[PDB]
Amino acid sequence: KDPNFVHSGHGGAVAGKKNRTWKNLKQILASERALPWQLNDPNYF
DNA sequence: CAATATCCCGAGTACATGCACAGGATGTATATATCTGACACGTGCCTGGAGACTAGGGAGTAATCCCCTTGGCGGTTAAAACGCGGGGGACAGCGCGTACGTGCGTTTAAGCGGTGCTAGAGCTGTCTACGACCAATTGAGCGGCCTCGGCA
Numbered sequence: 001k002d003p004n005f006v007h008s009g010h011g012g013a014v015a016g017k018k019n020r021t022w023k024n025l026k027q028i029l030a031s032e033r034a035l036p037w038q039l040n041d042p043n044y045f
Numbered sequence: 046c047a048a049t050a051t052c053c054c055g056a057g058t059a060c061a062t063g064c065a066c067a068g069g070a071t072g073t074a075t076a077t078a079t080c081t082g083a084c085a086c087g088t089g090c091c092t093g094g095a096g097a098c099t100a101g102g103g104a105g106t107a108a109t110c111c112c113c114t115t116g117g118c119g120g121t122t123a124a125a126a127c128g129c130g131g132g133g134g135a136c137a138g139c140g141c142g143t144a145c146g147t148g149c150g151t152t153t154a155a156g157c158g159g160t161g162c163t164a165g166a167g168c169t170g171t172c173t174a175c176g177a178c179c180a181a182t183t184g185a186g187c188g189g190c191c192t193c194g195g196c197a
């Protein structure tokens with residue numbers, strides 16, 4: 001009936017005290033600024 | 046002496062208190078723990094002692110009238126007591142906050158290595174501030190010149 005029930009653990013706060021569902025957008029972006037971008041590349045920031 | 050008042054004693058009066066009860070949360074109890082700091086050891090400083098001397102101050106006195114102190118002052122209200130007004134006092138209910146419980150997830154503490162901020166260094170090296178002295182100013186009091194009011 002329903003599409004699925006054995007849903008995967010994508011990243012929620014089961015394993016520790018950290019923020020509940022997932023990182024906020026600012027924290028995501030702080031991890032995107034680490035990548036090997038080059039001077040012509042489109043981006044979100 | 047009369048009068049308003051405080052004091053005192055017994056009847057009658059709700060509930061307050063001290064108690065008994067169920068039960069729950071925490072104080073105990075044991076074992077373990079490192080580490081606070083106790084204790085022991087010297088380090089080196091100032092707290093103290095101890096002298097010589099001036100000059101600042103302190104103590105003393107003398108003279109005295111300022112200020113306090115007192116009496117007697119004249120003037121007006123806080124108190125006394127009453128009349129007199131409204132206002133502090135005793136019940137019915139709403140629902141809003143406070144509490145309290147749930148699951149909310151933010152941040153701190155800790156232990157990590159790196160490093161630059163600060164706080165003890167100088168004779169730093171001077172020179173603001175510290176006396177030292179001079180000079181200006183105002184004010185006050187004392188002489189001295191000059192119109193006029195009461196007296197011969």
